Design a binder for this molecule. Structure first.
Ligand code: CL
Length: 292
């Protein structure tokens, strides 16, 4: 039931996509909001689909949905209730799946393509950059009330797995890993923001974070994302010594074909899911694909 098994027992590496903001703004979207996904998903759903399609064309084997900040908590500020919010969250999956369908028409040989439902941290709902600090404090029960509607909406709309990403807080991580056991068929990767090579943003030694996630077979991969490019390889090599789960790495771009240069380094550090975060485009993926 591991959706990675199809691809990883055929290739050492699989490619994720990259930032969506970048090609929405080149397509003419103004996003000066943290709840920008609400407007686009409603006003310009097609643009999001087209961004997914472009990453697929560029070599991406997995779309990450536009749900990073699509929570009932977040969208309540736009006067949307939980069910209105879940319909949007689910739309983000449908859009990525209609993109995938479109890409298979253009390329019948393309192989297995995945859709990962994006699950942002609580810090991304607090518009403060806390997702790279994790200096927030909630009960496990509290994180779970936060995450559940999105988790159900992502799964109900057909995500092949959840992308639990940009995670700074160890308590939130355990809450999320506890939450997923309520949905036995769900599979997820857990990806973290760091303070350093050996620690989560909040301070937790990565040893603790792995020992925990080790006990949840639903967590089918883990690693790091939205990390500076220069900080990726040290973190990976440390993870690599704690787990042989497939490792995940998608860092910020180097500037502002070079993120792509780390490929060999990462793969040797056990990385098997590779893509990009802030400031990346389909160009970064095409370069990864060229170097594989
Ligand atoms: Cl993005």
């Amino acid at each position: 039931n591991n959706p990675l098994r199809a691809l990883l027992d055929k290739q050492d590496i699989l490619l994720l996509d990259g930032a969506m903001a970048t090609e929405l703004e080149a397509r003419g979207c103004n996003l000066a909001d943290s709840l920008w996904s609400a407007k686009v998903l409603v006003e310009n759903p097609e643009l999001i689909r087209e961004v997914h399609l472009d990453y697929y064309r560029a070599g991406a084997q997995c779309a990450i949905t536009a749900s990073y900040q699509a929570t009932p908590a977040g969208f309540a500020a736009r006067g949307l209730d939980e069910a209105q919010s879940k319909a949007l969250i689910g739309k983000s999956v449908e859009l990525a799946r209609k993109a995938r369908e479109a890409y298979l028409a253009e390329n019948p040989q393309a192989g297995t393509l995945l859709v990962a439902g994006s699950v942002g941290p609580y810090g991304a709902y607090l518009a403060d950059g806390s997702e790279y600090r994790g200096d927030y404090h909630c009960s496990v029960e509290a994180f779970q009330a936060f995450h559940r509607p999105r988790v159900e909406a992502l799964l109900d709309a057909g995500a092949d797995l959840l992308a639990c990403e940009t995670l700074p807080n160890f308590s939130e991580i355990e809450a999320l890993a506890e939450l997923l056991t309520a949905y036995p068929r769900a599979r997820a990767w857990f990806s973290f923001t760091l303070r350093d090579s050996e620690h989560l943003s909040d301070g937790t030694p990565l040893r603790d974070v792995v020992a925990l996630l080790a006990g949840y077979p639903q967590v089918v991969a883990l690693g790091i994302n939205c990390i500076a490019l220069e900080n990726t390889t040290a973190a990976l090599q440390h993870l690599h010594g704690l787990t042989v789960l497939p490792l995940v790495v998608y860092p910020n771009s180097g500037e502002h074909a070079q993120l792509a240069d780390y490929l060999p380094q990462w793969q040797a550090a056990g990385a098997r899911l590779i893509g990009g975060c802030c400031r990346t485009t389909p160009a970064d993926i095409a370069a990864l694909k060229a170097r594989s």
